[PDB]
Design a protein around this ligand. Structure first.
Ligand SMILES: Nc1ncnc2c1ncn2[C@@H]1O[C@H](COP(=O)(O)OP(=O)(O)OP(=O)(O)O)[C@@H](O)[C@H]1O
Ligand SMILES: [Mg+2]
Lengths: 647, 31, 389
């Protein structure tokens, strides 16, 4: 009965048109609340995007432990509930929501699975078995990616001025924000290091250290507000030269917070028009990241005025793509509502129309699975202009189809056919969309296609394919993919403009030595993370034009990728937030789907003691019925109680 | 200009890290 | 409407195929997605075929206009010159010259010939076994890891002290102790060229064909920068040379001597590290066992009590065993047993549970499995002979 109902409702919600999904979700939530399955109710409420219902369920929850585990789940998803000062353990619940102690937990997992030994970029390169500023940039990027969230390294934590000066031009920003991402996730004691670097005589280095502070605070939530202070102090008056590091660091630091103070600090710097078009685009991007999913009238209006005011040739010039991108990030997943914005953009300008319209439309219908919407996108794809709208449209099919386990593979087939029958821009874009549709999820057709098309004659298609393959391998350090990337490095040994992408893919594959995942979804394959999808869409829309953005001077978007960095975790906790090493078995997925057979049975049993670093698509269940798990699904941090029935 | 910004950042980030230290001390005392 | 939906789905697939490309695999053709006809026409009209020859001699090698004696295999020998795109230094007196037709001069230097049999030995797909799947031989794992991985991972810690790491290991022990298991673990964990060889694969029907492919194997390893070779079942060709009176084992002794000379002879053996897996380390030639060729002989003795308990744990990690395990009792109950015996015991416990139609394997099932695998099969055991061997 319960299993039948809940499973059928979930599957149909994933596989049903728009009008019925909401009603089915309502009745699913009602059944869960009736049977008193509060974590399930919370998951359904979040996937509904019903913060009011989320608060109602969370407050109705009068169990301290279950409430704290709900706080863990909501923190991992990304939300900062403003709980009133009368609840079960207000302070503990609030700090769990803020996601503090994540540094300690990550370090604890590293110690349990010893990975604290730093890995220098040359270690992953393994050049002893197989330039200049470009190589310095690539090495810094891969070093940061591999040593992210550890607060440890061997290049920058050791003598770091040498690395900074070996890097050139924007390599200064690259290295500084790489250090920031190394100290990511609650190394806020690292404000000391980043401050004693930003006390610098070099503008690029100082701004990169400001971006480092922002990225370190990214994901983190500290009531002391450790970002707004630095960011405002630097961005209040100097709005002429670059400002990109500051604005981007603020946006990455706060993201899903949606704090009116940061919104109203970021809006005027965009609306002033005294800051370069790059700053305007990055400011719209930061506003979108701060407000990923709001229907925020202020952000929408300011973006519309910016688009109107910017000259026709300015809109033609790149980096204008980030303004409609910011508007879409604001209208992330809100669905139909955007009609007003769509009409406004349609009446704004003729040629920039296709681009902005398609971008906002796809970014608003992300995950909807609207087949008619994807058909509109495919008709736009068929109509060849004789291109930017083409690329964002292919990205749109990916973004909208990454919601169903069947539609995803079918969109992979559609992407293969798109590359087969495509035009230059279509082919250039397809790898980015095909990376979006599968992130941190190695798949032996995605990897094969991307590897095949990396060698492709089109240099930009090669760039996108290599970065896409690194993306697919993100946080899943795999022998096959590492060997493939090393082989590609050998292939494009001489080509620096492509070897940089190859090295970036290597580092992004060995992300955190292998601890994290850039996949937007989490939990049990249907929970979109607005912040993570915003970051991924930022990076991929920037890559849509790869030469002049990433290979130029705008890899702060690569650093914005951090908005989607979340761990693959199974740490278990005591009722009073203490470690509980408990035997747990792991596996991918197995069951008999009769009526509504739950796909919770796991056959690839692999007994482990928590912490456990599970991979993509693996469900870890308890080894024995000695502890009951408050959460039905064991993902991320968990609180396990002692089964009063029997050990 | 640059020196004024640097001194402002120095004093105010010292204040910020001090506040963070108080937060962590409160957490540990609770623990 | 279900059947209508499947019928439409298959009709749609049929139309997609009929309009894109359906079936071309008889003559090994490819799907038409990666069909660059525009490029292949220019390829056939701009890249002329090149017949592979060998530069025999360089007459008048001095700066004066030289002449190269090529030997187009089985076709003819010629005196030729270089293409103006090819630098003189790029070609030596033994490289595969790769000359065009029609005034055989359009040169492309070409690597040494490798027998397809020899080249189909590199381990492309790495085994799914890890060092955590091997239990009860901690010291053996440490020594093998040192020799094969550590120089290939952190050479600085060796060049700092000026040490030449041992380059050569002989994993020897009774049938089933983790020899091939550890070889697979090394292949999985190693970032280098792993080349597996089977002693039986060096037995060839024509005199000088075993030694020929040994030479080809070692020179391919030399062409590669960091290579681990793994001769499994080395007993096949590696045997003490005996005069006899009818010339027995002359060919296998010749190929073994070629391997000996390649491991340590009048030449720097290169950055090749060799493994020798065997369960009869008493036939191997003394020259083969010399520590200039097998530096780090490792014994995979039958696991002790702790090793047997660890192996039982490893093999029962993923099983559906019940609460109380007493794998220590099982280990003491099956002494002088192999990891193969232990895995068979675990498997037979699982099969006893399955036969009883249970989903939980219990201590009684494990004891029945021990009785079946250790006691009943005691007469088929290889340890009593191969411990002497
Ligand atoms: N020490 C061990 N730890 C774990 N499993 C082991 C061990 N020894 C043997 N096994 C099991 O036995 C098989 C490994 O035997 P392997 O092929 O390595 O034997 P070998 O020593 O090379 O013998 P042979 O002389 O028959 O070639 C695998 O099933 C492995 O599970
Ligand atoms: Mg063997």
């Amino acid at each position: 009965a319960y299993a039948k109902v809940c499973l059928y409702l979930t599957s149909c919600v994933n596989y049903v048109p728009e009008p019925e999904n909401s009603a089915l979700l309502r009745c699913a939530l009602g059944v869960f609340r009736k049977f008193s399955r509060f974590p399930e109710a919370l998951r359904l409420a979040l996937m509904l995007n019903d913060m009011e219902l989320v608060e109602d369920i969370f407050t109705s929850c009068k169990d301290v432990v279950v409430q704290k585990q709900m706080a863990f789940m909501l923190g991992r998803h990304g939300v900062f509930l403003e709980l009133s000062e009368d609840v079960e353990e207000y302070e503990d619940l609030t700090e769990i929501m803020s996601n503090v102690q994540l540094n300690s937990n990550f370090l604890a997992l590293a110690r349990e699975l010893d990975i604290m030994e730093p890995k220098v970029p040359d270690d992953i390169y393994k050049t002893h078995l197989e330039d200049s500023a470009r190589m310095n940039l690539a090495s810094s990027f891969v070093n940061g990616f591999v040593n992210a969230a550890f607060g440890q390294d061997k290049l920058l934590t050791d003598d770091g001025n040498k690395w900074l000066y070996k890097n050139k031009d924007h390599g200064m920003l690259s290295a500084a924000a790489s250090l920031g991402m190394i100290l990511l996730w609650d190394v806020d004691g690292g404000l000391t290091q980043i401050d004693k670097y930003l006390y610098s005589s070099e503008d690029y280095i100082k701004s990169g250290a400001l971006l480092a502070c922002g990225i370190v605070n990214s994901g983190v939530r500290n009531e002391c507000d450790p970002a707004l202070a630095l960011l405002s102090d630097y961005v209040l008056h100097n709005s002429n030269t670059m400002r990109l590091g500051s604005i981007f660091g603020l946006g990455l630091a706060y993201a899903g917070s949606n704090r009116e103070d940061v919104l109203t600090l970021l809006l005027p710097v965009m609306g002033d028009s005294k800051s370069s078009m790059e700053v305007a685009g990055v400011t719209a991007l930061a506003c979108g990241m701060i407000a990923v999913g709001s229907c925020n009238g202020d952000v929408t209006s300011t973006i519309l005025q910016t688009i109107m005011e910017k000259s026709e040739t300015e809109l033609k010039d790149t980096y204008a793509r980030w303004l409609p991108l910011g508007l879409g990030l604001n209208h992330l997943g809100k669905g139909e509502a955007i009609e007003a914005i769509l009409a406004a953009l349609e009446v704004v300008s003729e040629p920039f129309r296709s681009f902005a319209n398609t971008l906002v439309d796809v970014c608003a219908y992300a995950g909807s699975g609207n087949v008619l919407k994807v058909q509109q996108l495919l008709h736009i794809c068929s109509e060849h202009f004789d291109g930017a709208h083409q690329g964002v449209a292919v990205l749109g099919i990916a973004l909208i189809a990454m919601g169903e386990e069947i539609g995803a593979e079918m969109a992979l087939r559609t992407f293969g056919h798109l590359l087969r029958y495509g035009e230059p821009t279509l082919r250039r874009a397809v790898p980015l969309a095909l990376a979006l549709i599968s992130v941190s999820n190695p798949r032996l057709n995605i990897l094969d296609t991307l590897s095949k098309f990396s060698h492709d004659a089109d240099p930009e298609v090669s760039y996108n394919s290599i970065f896409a393959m690194g993306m697919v391998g993100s946080g899943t350090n795999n022998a096959r993919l590492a060997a493939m990337l090393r082989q590609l490095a050998q292939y494009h040994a001489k080509d620096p403009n492509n070897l940089f992408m190859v090295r970036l893919a290597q580092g992004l594959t060995h992300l955190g030595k292998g601890t994290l995942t850039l996949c937007p979804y989490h939990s049990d394959r249907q929970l979109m993370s607005q912040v993570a999808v915003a970051g991924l869409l930022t990076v991929l829309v920037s890559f849509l034009d790869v030469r002049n953005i990433i290979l130029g001077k705008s890899h702060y978007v690569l650093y914005g990728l951090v908005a989607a960095m979340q761990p693959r975790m199974l740490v278990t906790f005591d009722e009073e937030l203490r470690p509980l090493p408990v035997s747990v078995r792991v596996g991918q997925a197995v069951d008999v789907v009769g009526q509504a057979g739950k796909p919770k049975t796991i056959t690839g049993f692999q007994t482990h003691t928590t912490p456990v670093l599970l991979a993509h698509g693996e469900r870890a269940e308890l080894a024995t019925e000695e502890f009951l798990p408050v959460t039905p699904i064991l993902e991320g941090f968990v609180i396990l109680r002692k089964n009063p029935n029997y050990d | 200009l640059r020196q004024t910004e640097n001194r402002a950042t120095r004093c105010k980030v010292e204040r910020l890290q001090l506040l963070l230290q108080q937060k962590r001390l409160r957490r540990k005392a609770r623990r | 409407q279900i059947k209508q939906v499947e019928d439409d789905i298959q009709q749609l697939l049929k139309k997609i195929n009929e309009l894109t490309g359906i079936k071309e695999s008889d003559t090994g053709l490819a799907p038409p997605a990666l069909w660059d006809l525009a490029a292949d026409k220019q390829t056939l009209q701009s890249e002329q075929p090149l017949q592979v020859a060998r530069c025999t001699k360089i007459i008048n090698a001095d700066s004066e206009d030289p002449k190269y004696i090529i030997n187009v295999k089985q076709f003819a020998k010629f005196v030729v010159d270089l293409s103006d795109q090819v630098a003189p230094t790029d070609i030596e007196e033994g490289m595969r010259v790769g000359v065009d037709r029609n005034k055989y001069q359009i040169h492309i230097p070409l690597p040494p010939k490798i027998d397809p049999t020899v080249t189909m030995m590199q381990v492309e797909e790495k085994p799914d076994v890890t060092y955590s799947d091997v239990g009860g031989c901690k010291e053996q794992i440490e020594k093998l890891r040192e020799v094969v991985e550590t120089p290939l991972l952190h050479p600085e810690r060796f060049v700092n002290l000026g040490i030449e790491p041992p380059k050569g290991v002989l994993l020897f022990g009774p049938p089933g102790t983790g020899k091939t298991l550890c070889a697979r673990a090394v292949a999985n964990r190693t970032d280098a060229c792993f080349i597996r060889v089977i002693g039986s694969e060096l037995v060839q029907k024509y005199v000088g064909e075993g030694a020929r492919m040994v030479r080809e194997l070692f020179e391919m390893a030399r062409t590669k920068k960091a290579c681990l070779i793994f001769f499994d079942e080395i007993d096949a060709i590696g045997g003490a040379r005996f005069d006899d009176g009818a010339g027995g084992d002359n060919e296998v002794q010749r190929t073994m001597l070629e391997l000996i000379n390649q491991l340590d002879g009048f030449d720097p053996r290169g950055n090749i590290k060799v493994l020798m897996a065997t369960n009869r380390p008493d036939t191997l030639d003394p020259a083969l066992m010399r520590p200039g060729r097998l530096d780090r002989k490792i014994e995979f003795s039958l696991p002790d009590l702790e090793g047997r308990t660890h192996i039982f744990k490893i093999h029962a990690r993923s099983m559906s065993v019940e609460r109380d395990i007493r794998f220590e009792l099982l280990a003491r109950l099956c002494p002088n047993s192999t990891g193969a015996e232990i895995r068979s015991v675990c498997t037979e416990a699982g099969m006893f549970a399955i036969r009883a139609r249970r989903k939980i394997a219990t201590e009684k099932d494990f004891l029945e499995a021990v009785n079946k695998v250790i006691k009943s099969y005691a007469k088929f055991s290889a340890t009593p002979r191969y411990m002497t061997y």
